[PDB]
Amino acid sequence: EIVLTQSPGTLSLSPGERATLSCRASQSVSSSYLAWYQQKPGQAPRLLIYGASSRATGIPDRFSGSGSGTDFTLTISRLEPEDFAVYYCQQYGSSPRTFGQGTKLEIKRTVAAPSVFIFPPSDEQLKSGTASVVCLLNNFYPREAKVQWKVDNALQSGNSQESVTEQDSKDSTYSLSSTLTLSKADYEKHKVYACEVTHQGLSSPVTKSFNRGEC
Amino acid sequence: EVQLVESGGGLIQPGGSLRLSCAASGFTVSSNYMSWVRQAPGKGLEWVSVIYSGGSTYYADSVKGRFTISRDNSKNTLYLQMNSLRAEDTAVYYCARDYGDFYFDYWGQGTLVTVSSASTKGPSVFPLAPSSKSTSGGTAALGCLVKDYFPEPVTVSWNSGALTSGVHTFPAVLQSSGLYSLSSVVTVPSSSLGTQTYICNVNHKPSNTKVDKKVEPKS
Amino acid sequence: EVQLVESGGGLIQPGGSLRLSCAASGFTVSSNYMSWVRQAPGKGLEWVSVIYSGGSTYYADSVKGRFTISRDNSKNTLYLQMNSLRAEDTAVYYCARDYGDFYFDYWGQGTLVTVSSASTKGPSVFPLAPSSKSTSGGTAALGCLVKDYFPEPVTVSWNSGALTSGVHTFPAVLQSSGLYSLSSVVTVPSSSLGTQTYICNVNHKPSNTKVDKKVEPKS
Amino acid sequence: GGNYNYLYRLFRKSNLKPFERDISTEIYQAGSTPCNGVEGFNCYFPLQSYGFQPTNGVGYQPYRVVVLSFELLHAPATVCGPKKSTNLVKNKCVNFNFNGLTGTGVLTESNKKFLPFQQFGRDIADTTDAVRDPQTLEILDITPCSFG
Ligand SMILES: *[C@@H]1O[C@H](CO)[C@@H](O[C@@H]2O[C@H](CO)[C@@H](O)[C@H](O)[C@H]2NC(C)=O)[C@H](O)[C@H]1NC(C)=O
């Protein structure tokens, strides 16, 4: 059977060191009839190496793929930091051309705590009849951050949404935005809105909070 | 060898039909293979179809009986006519120049195929003011919240593209209502709360919405 | 014997086609007759079509050559596929379980078939404030005016469904512009003009409009 | 080690007419610019070799192919299949066929001598009365079997 399965699925490292990864099939393939690909997020995916032997032009030589059969590896001899992307394996031996799922390559910049900031809803929105309460977490290595909303000290579950940015190409940090959504009516029923952030760079969690209706 | 621009995709109700176009440049588009490949936004890469230099075509099994590819080598324009549109063929698609072993060496830019759903609505914008609760020492953050729109590709710039420092647009979020929402924020020295210009330029390309909103400290 | 929910109807431009669905529950839908009956909103009840347990169908003479009924007894779902839609087939329709003599004993819920006209527009809402001209002694009345919408089924509640005393929504009116309008009013003790919460919750189901408007005494 | 001496073309401007043939290998241009008869970008070699090995999977094995293509049209056929030859009795009214000559009668050893290109002999009043056996090339008389 022909299904490409990544070994780890993601790798977080530090630049300047030898990177090595593989992609595993679901059968032995006819000889070296596969390839690799990389994907820059927000960009087009690009060639990596044909036939698992030699790569095409426009690519330098820090990279090497090997293997035979089910196992097929790819080794980067030294971690260039600007090469941090999502990397794919691709086959062309079977009668369809199947793919895998990708491997994430990045770095673990020294533990950095987030700058936290809470934004109350704008007066324009309370006219409309709804209240968004935004809480921002700025720059931060470990993305495994927790955002606990509290309304009058009641932990709020199921009315928030988060999103997170791609690891920053300059300082290798993440940034996160959590939005709490309420009705105008329900907003006007409570006083303290708080956002409590937990993170490895914080010795104890940080809470940023405001009091509805206090200039 | 500068080539493979894509165009045409976007908001379309199911049951319709669409011919996409991937034009190339500086290349004999007749005497090779091209291909189509999808990219589901949470998932990987899945091959759609191929053409030959002789002209023979092949497709995926799911898109069998539905999708027709063609080209005009007088104008060097590949045509992906997709028909009987279902609400799971919602990926972004890529035209790809093909070589030999069916390596996809040269790649297109991409265009969004979005099945009907909530139609196309324009964004509602609010300015999130810089505040002392956002202020800390030397810097303070301000931004713009652009919410409730269906047609996924939307952009917000700061000062017509001037500020590139601290400007960070966060991934749009898909609500239960079915409409997207996002917020883009930028930090700026706290000595400069209202001093200079900070106007977010909101442009919605599937529609034709263009609005500039100024963000100022709270009253 | 709890059964016959209907769904599917609404805003549709003429010349189109629609398959309606009436699903039932707790019943062998194969081994009986079903039927369809219309109800013009100013007029009486007019039979549309019948099916047999063997499977033979019959129709009205006006809908001859146009309308096809069917069912799936694997999923117990009746299908009324109506085609070549004219702008006089604008009634609400009812699936009906049939017995014997062709009595329609068990009845559906209903769904609106509305031919194209002015398309689908959202409502504009104003609060009609409680005033001394509405006040008399112990009580005073306040309400919400929801106007200019095409897609007939629209609802306004008071305080998320809390107040059931004095809340009275008046029949929508059809203007010369072609759009509907209505106003729902509720009386409340005059000692309680602004005291408690009186927010009208406007929901437009063919669209996805949901807005809460507070009504307060005049400035 | 492998057998890469078996190749195939993988590029052409168009398809083929039935049993067309091309041996001419030229650097197949997709550049729209002439490339000196030399290789490089968008001018490639039109042929591809087979990569074979004994540990290849099923289907990736050398399969020796032969096709048949027949000729009929007008004119006189030149090819022909095989032929059966039971045996020849003698002195037993029999139903015989000698490469076309269909008849009935008793067959008997002869003592006439044809010329070495004559197949059968005829009587006055034109009835076949002798034949030559194709396999052994001996003359046999044909007498009718008895009636009266
Ligand atoms: C036809 O084939 C037969 C063999 O099947 C040839 O025959 C033999 O002829 C030789 C001649 O001396 C004899 O000694 C053998 O006894 C024969 N064997 C059999 C099996 O008959 C014969 O010569 C061939 N004739 C022609 C014209 O090809």
Author numbering:
A (entry chain L): 1 to 215
B (entry chain H), C (entry chain G): 1 to 219
D (entry chain A): 446 to 593
Text lifted from the article:
The prefusion structure of S protein exhibits more dynamic conformational changes in S1 region, especially in RBD, which has two distinctive conformations, “up” and “down”.10,11 Only the “up” conformation of RBD can bind to the ACE2 receptor. To further explore the interactions between nAbs and S proteins, we solved cryo-electron microscopy (cryo-EM) structures of the S protein in complex with ten nAbs, in full-length IgG-form or in both IgG-form and Fab-form.
The first group, including P2B-1A10, P5A-3A1, P5A-1B8, P5A-2G9, P5A-1B6, P2B-1A1 and P5A-2G7, has the largest overlap between the epitope and the ACE2-binding site on the RBD. This might explain the large difference of neutralization potency between P5A-3A1 IgG and Fab.
